Amino acid sequence: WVTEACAQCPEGFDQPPVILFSMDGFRAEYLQTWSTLLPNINKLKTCGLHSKYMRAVYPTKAFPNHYTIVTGLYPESHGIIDNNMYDVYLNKNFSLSSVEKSNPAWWSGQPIWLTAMYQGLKAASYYWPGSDVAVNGSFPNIYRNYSNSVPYESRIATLLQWLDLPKAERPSFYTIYVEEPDSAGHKSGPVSAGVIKALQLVDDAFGMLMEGLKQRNLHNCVNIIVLADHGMDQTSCDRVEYMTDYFPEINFYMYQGPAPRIRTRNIPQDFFTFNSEEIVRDLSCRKSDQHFKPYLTPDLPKRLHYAKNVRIDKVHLMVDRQWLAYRNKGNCEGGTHGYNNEFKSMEAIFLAHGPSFKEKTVIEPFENIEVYNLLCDLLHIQPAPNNGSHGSLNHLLKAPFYQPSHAEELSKSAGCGFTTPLPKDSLNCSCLALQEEQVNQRLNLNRGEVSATEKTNLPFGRPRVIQKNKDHCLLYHREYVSGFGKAMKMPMWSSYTVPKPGDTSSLPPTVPDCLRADVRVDPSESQKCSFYLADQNIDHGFLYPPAIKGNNESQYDALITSNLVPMYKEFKKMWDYFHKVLLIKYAIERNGVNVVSGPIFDYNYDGHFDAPDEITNYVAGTDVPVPTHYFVVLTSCKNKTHTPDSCPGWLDVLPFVVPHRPTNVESCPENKAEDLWVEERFKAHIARVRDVELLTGLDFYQEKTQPVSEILQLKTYLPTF
Numbered sequence: 023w024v025t026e027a028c029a030q031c032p033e034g035f036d037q038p039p040v041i042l043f044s045m046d047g048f049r050a051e052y053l054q055t056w057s058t059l060l061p062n063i064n065k066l067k068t069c070g071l072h073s074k075y076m077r078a079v080y081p082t083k084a085f086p087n088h089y090t091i092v093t094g095l096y097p098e099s100h101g102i103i104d105n106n107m108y109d110v111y112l113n114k115n116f117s118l119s120s121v122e123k124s125n126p127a128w129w130s131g132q133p134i135w136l137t138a139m140y141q142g143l144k145a146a147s148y149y150w151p152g153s154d155v156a157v158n159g160s161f162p163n164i165y166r167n168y169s170n171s172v173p174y175e176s177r178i179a180t181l182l183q184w185l186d187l188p189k190a191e192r193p194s195f196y197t198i199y200v201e202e203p204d205s206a207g208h209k210s211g212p213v214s215a216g217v218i219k220a221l222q223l224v225d226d227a228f229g230m231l232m233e234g235l236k237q238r239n240l241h242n243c244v245n246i247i248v249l250a251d252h253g254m255d256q257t258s259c260d261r262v263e264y265m266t267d268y269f270p271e272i273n274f275y276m277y278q279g280p281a282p283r284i285r286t287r288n289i290p291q292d293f294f295t296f297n298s299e300e301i302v303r304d305l306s307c308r309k310s311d312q313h314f315k316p317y318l319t320p321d322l323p324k325r326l327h328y329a330k331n332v333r334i335d336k337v338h339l340m341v342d343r344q345w346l347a348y349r350n351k352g353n354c355e356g357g358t359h360g361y362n363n364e365f366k367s368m369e370a371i372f373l374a375h376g377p378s379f380k381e382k383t384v385i386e387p388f389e390n391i392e393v394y395n396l397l398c399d400l401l402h403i404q405p406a407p408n409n410g411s412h413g414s415l416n417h418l419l420k421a422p423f424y425q426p427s428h429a430e431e432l433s434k435s436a437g438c439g440f441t442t443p444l445p446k447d448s449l450n451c452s453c454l455a456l457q458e459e460q461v462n463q464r465l466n467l468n469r470g471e472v473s474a475t476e477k478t479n480l481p482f483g484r485p486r487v488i489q490k491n492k493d494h495c496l497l498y499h500r501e502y503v504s505g506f507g508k509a510m511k512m513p514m515w516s517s518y519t520v521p522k523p524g525d526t527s528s529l530p531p532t533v534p535d536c537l538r539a540d541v542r543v544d545p546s547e548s549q550k551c552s553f554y555l556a557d558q559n560i561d562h563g564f565l566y567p568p569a570i571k572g573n574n575e576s577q578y579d580a581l582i583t584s585n586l587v588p589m590y591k592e593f594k595k596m597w598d599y600f601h602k603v604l605l606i607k608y609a610i611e612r613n614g615v616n617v618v619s620g621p622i623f624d625y626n627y628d629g630h631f632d633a634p635d636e637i638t639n640y641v642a643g644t645d646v647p648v649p650t651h652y653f654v655v656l657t658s659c660k661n662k663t664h665t666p667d668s669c670p671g672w673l674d675v676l677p678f679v680v681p682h683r684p685t686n687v688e689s690c691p692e693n694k695a696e697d698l699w700v701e702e703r704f705k706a707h708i709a710r711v712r713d714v715e716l717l718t719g720l721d722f723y724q725e726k727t728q729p730v731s732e733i734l735q736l737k738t739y740l741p742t743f
């Protein structure tokens with residue numbers, strides 16, 4: 023097989039069997055550098071399909087990741103948030119060394135073997151976390167109780183024996199797990215002779231499987247996926263942070279290593295009463311060269327989706343590349359994993375071979391949460407509710423099983439039409455510059471003016487409202503278009519295409535002390551300038567920056583009540599710096615940039631837009647809700663020769679989900695100019711368009727002339743730097 027050229031199901035095989043092969047700790051880099059040393063995996067890389075890398079879930083550990091691959095769920099939803107965890111309600115400790123690993127109470131969701139079994143198919147497993155557990159009261163048709171020393175040849179032979187079974191007994195889905203190159207990675211690090219030997223050993227295991235399949239004439243019949251749970255990075259005992267250096271006495275329990283959690287020792291009693299906010303405060307900006315950052319789980323970057331679970335302790339530590347965090351100075355040599363999934367070293371491999379996959383294809387990176395829907399498509403079965411975007415992986419398949427469709431809008435735009443240029447209520451707003459209010463006629467756009475602003479500022483169409491009974495209206499202006507939320511008295515979204523900046527030297531500033539009522543929106547559905555007088559902590563901010571487009575006359579279209587959003591004074595410093603300096607820099611690099619911004623409400627930190635009853639903070643003595651986050655989605659043309667409003671091909675996206683916090687403690691900006699921490703803070707809160715979509719109840723790019731499957735690739739894309 024290994025010498026045979028790049029190449030078909032035999033009698034009794036109506037549907038192609040699926041084999042999911044996991045090579046633990048096989049980082050993406052190992053394939054990029056050492057593939058030519060691995061002849062069997064290199065043939066699979068040459069002939070089959072493979073991604074540049076597959077993104078794992080945080081923490082980049084075995085059990086949360088392996089269970090994510092087979093469920094399509096984030097650890098917070100499937101329950102396995104770590105290898106070591108504590109549940110207060112169950113009052114039990116989970117570990118790989120305890121019998122609690124086999125307790126079905128910890129395992130939520132529906133793994134692929136169960137999905138296949140519930141839909142008339144048989145499933146076998148030669149090791150996989152959860153497969154030796156009675157998840158939802160059931161085990162796979164054939165399974166093996168985990169035994170790490172069983173030779174690879176014996177595991178392969180048993181799997182080939184399962185494929186030799188008669189059609190009635192023979193399973194359609196198979197899982198197989200191998201401990202290497204992870205074990206070698208821990209011993210001597212990712213760049214060692216030990217990992218080379220381990221990589222050659224896993225190549226022999228894959229070689230035995232392919233040769234075994236060739237013997238049965240199944241090598242071009244079986245749809246095989248070879249992947250990893252996470253990557254590997256080098257550790258050092260000179261790269262360890264100690265909690266003794268920050269606390270005089272440690273009375274708390276700590277889950278040590280690359281993804282730390284802090285909780286009380288007195289469990290279950292003090293679990294909820296434990297001052298989690300005190301610990302994060304006592305660890306924030308303590309040392310200038312601090313190699314970790316403390317966080318309360320709702321404050322963690324939203325793209326991680328690591329907060330909505332009792333097992334996820336409120337205190338979390340984000341550890342820097344190649345560093346570790348422990349209780350005391352009392353392992354640390356070689357290598358480990360568990361770090362941020364965005365780190366290059368934490369990236370996993372993904373290779374596919376078989377009749378359902380595209381031959382000799384290199385695909386762009388994607389997330390392991392998408393594998394579940396792909397496995398369902400290969401097995402011709404319906405997926406259970408998960409976090410993958412069904413259809414985003416169709417570009418991997420020769421003939422896709424599922425055809426995705428645009429999300430249907432649940433609420434239509436109504437009202438806010440121009441009637442009179444004279445406001446019925448001033449809303450306690452003042453603009454001494456005026457005077458006449460003839461600038462209100464600039465808000466009265468004709469049919470051709472609406473079409474001109476729709477073509478420029480909504481080039482991919484308006485974001486659709488995927489919310490029931492959401493009373494809203496669209497507001498058209500020469501420089502921007504917005505979707506105003508009537509009940510919350512603020513826009514849900516604001517869209518505008520910034521053209522390529524010329525001068526940049528002396529740009530006009532924002533017109534000060536000028537704010538007035540919007541004649542198009544009802545006074546009862548509008549924000550008042552007097553609302554921001556009573557509250558001292560929160561002030562008003564502009565969603566669309568008035569001075570970014572046009573002249574002085576253009577600024578008046580944005581200096582209205584409908585462009586106001588509740589903003590913390592410290593947050594406004596980041597927001598105004600981004601729109602004045604960073605946004606112009608991005609518009610130069612991208613040859614113009616389309617911007618869609620708006621508020622996010624996620625008080626229950628579940629990654630979904632809040633229902634009105636879920637909002638727990640408002641502008642003092644008003645019903646105006648305070649956003650938990652602010653989104654900024656930047657869209658430009660992939661081909662930089664075109665502007666965002668005249669882009670025929672693919673698009674390039676850069677979304678941000680920035681926490682709306684009263685302090686900038688996360689950036690540690692004491693005695694530091696904004697050019698040293700604002701960009702770093704925005705970059706730390708980069709997310710996918712899909713993340714923005716879930717947090718807002720909006721759907722983007724529905725008017726882009728491209729198939730839904732290609733648009734889903736753009737929506738699941740995570741920009742990296």
Ligand SMILES: CC(=O)N[C@H]1[C@@H](OP(=O)(O)OP(=O)(O)OC[C@H]2O[C@@H](n3ccc(=O)[nH]c3=O)[C@H](O)[C@@H]2O)O[C@H](CO)[C@@H](O)[C@@H]1O
Pocket residue numbers: 046047082083084085105118149150151152168170199204208251278279280358359360
């Ligand atoms: C074995 C090992 O080096 N584990 C390290 C890893 O944990 P982690 O839990 O992520 O495990 P690894 O990815 O390193 O290796 C797989 C582990 O899962 C077990 N397994 C695998 C498959 C299966 O079906 N069933 C099963 O029980 C293996 O016995 C092994 O212990 O990162 C931690 C980071 O803080 C380290 O402290 C741990 O020492």
Ligand SMILES: *[C@@H]1O[C@H](CO)[C@@H](O[C@@H]2O[C@H](CO)[C@@H](O)[C@H](O)[C@H]2NC(C)=O)[C@H](O)[C@H]1NC(C)=O
Pocket residue numbers: 130131132136140158
């Ligand atoms: C746990 O197993 C039960 C039983 O197999 C599943 O319940 C079935 O769900 C389907 C789809 O909703 C229904 O058509 C069946 O009538 C249900 N059967 C019973 C006995 O209730 C359940 O969905 C499984 N749960 C998970 C998370 O996989």
Ligand SMILES: *[C@@H]1O[C@H](CO)[C@@H](O[C@@H]2O[C@H](CO)[C@@H](O)[C@H](O)[C@H]2NC(C)=O)[C@H](O)[C@H]1NC(C)=O
Pocket residue numbers: 165166167
């Ligand atoms: C995996 O190990 C468990 C034991 O930990 C086995 O479960 C036992 O199976 C017998 C029947 O063969 C039952 O009478 C026992 O009550 C079970 N014990 C427990 C604790 O569940 C299981 O059969 C093993 N699986 C394989 C494939 O060997």
Ligand SMILES: *[C@@H]1O[C@H](CO)[C@@H](O[C@@H]2O[C@H](CO)[C@@H](O)[C@H](O)[C@H]2NC(C)=O)[C@H](O)[C@H]1NC(C)=O
Pocket residue numbers: 108113114115275287288289290
């Ligand atoms: C789960 O493991 C932890 C850590 O080993 C145990 O924590 C101890 O809990 C008691 C109170 O029940 C405290 O007084 C001790 O100080 C804790 N020890 C440590 C090392 O933190 C906990 O008891 C275990 N729970 C179960 C149910 O096994």
Ligand SMILES: *[C@@H]1O[C@H](CO)[C@@H](O[C@@H]2O[C@H](CO)[C@@H](O)[C@H](O)[C@H]2NC(C)=O)[C@H](O)[C@H]1NC(C)=O
Pocket residue numbers: 095096099100130131327407408409628629630716
């Ligand atoms: C990831 O997918 C899961 C499953 O669809 C989502 O969790 C469900 O959320 C609803 C409430 O919106 C609950 O009624 C279900 O019980 C949850 N199911 C499970 C298995 O937990 C989850 O919200 C999704 N996550 C994101 C961020 O979209």
Ligand SMILES: *[C@@H]1O[C@H](CO)[C@@H](O)[C@H](O)[C@H]1NC(C)=O
Pocket residue numbers: 661663664
């Ligand atoms: C970019 O667009 C121009 C036309 O404006 C075209 O000639 C060029 O080939 C495109 N570049 C790529 C990489 O497709």
Ligand SMILES: [Ca+2]
Pocket residue numbers: 623624625626627628629630631632633636
């Ligand atoms: Ca929510």
Ligand SMILES: [Zn+2]
Pocket residue numbers: 046047083084204251252
């Ligand atoms: Zn692993």
Ligand SMILES: [Zn+2]
Pocket residue numbers: 047204205208359
């Ligand atoms: Zn490991």
